[PDB]
From Swiss-Prot, chain D:
Organism: Escherichia coli (strain K12)
HAMAP family in the cross-refs: Acyl_carrier (MF_01217)
Main location per the UniProt record: cytoplasm
Localization of this protein: Cytoplasm
Entry annotated with the keyword Phosphoprotein: yes
Residue ranges constituting the Carrier domain according to the UniProt record: 1-72
Keyword Cytoplasm set for record: yes
Name listed for the protein in its UniProt record: Acyl carrier protein
One Pfam family here: PP-binding
PROSITE patterns linked to this entry: CARRIER, PHOSPHOPANTETHEINE
PTM annotation: 4'-phosphopantetheine is transferred from CoA to a specific serine of apo-ACP by AcpS. This modification is essential for activity because fatty acids are bound in thioester linkage to the sulfhydryl of the prosthetic group.
GO biological process: fatty acid biosynthetic process; lipid A biosynthetic process; lipid biosynthetic process; response to xenobiotic stimulus
Function text: Carrier of the growing fatty acid chain in fatty acid biosynthesis.
Keyword terms: Cytoplasm, Fatty acid biosynthesis, Fatty acid metabolism, Lipid biosynthesis, Lipid metabolism, Phosphopantetheine, Phosphoprotein
Amino acid sequence: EMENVQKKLRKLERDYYQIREQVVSAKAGWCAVMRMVKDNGVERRLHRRE
Amino acid sequence: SSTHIEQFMPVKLAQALANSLFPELDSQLRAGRHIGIDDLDNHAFLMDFQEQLEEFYARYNVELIRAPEGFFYLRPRST
Amino acid sequence: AIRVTQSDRDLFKHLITEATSYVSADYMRHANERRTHLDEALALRGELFG
Amino acid sequence: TIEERVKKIIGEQLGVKQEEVTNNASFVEDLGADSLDTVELVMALEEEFDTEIPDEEAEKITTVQAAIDYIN
């Protein structure tokens, strides 16, 4: 059973790697907007948590 | 139908140009005078037909402009 | 005086409200996609470690 | 190199200047990276060098000097 579960573990590992790469790529792009919205435009006006 | 003001001009614009205040105002405006809130007659007139006047003067390649403070004036284009 | 000010106000308000509606919506869309993928990555990470 | 690949990752994951990121520059107070920003920073550090880090030992890292110390 532990061997059988380790195969599930490895599937999860590959999935996790893919998701990791995608998340990092998103952050890289979003950084530019953050540097650009330092004008005090973000604090409340743009970031409407509602 | 034919021979009808609407064929050539909007009714409100013709109504404005036919007013007794127009020649004075026109003359002045062309000369560069600014119009504020104190000269009621003129100011009110301007307010009533703003868009028609703007459209009119546009023919000349000049903008009839309204500053935030409520005063009107003429700004010519390069052409 | 009234006739002036009322106008001015109308234009101000309309531009403000529509522009914020137009921009904030997509800004939050992006933020939410990034949040979602990060959350999925963290759940995968924790489950993999355990 | 590792000691400048760390800067490559940190600057482009927090958007701060290369000059700002010194060895002792802490992420939260100097670089301003908050909870999720630091999470993404550690994820990027993992990806760059294709390694993995424990949860507690990773969260212990809260500075450029500490970042390199665990990296190198």
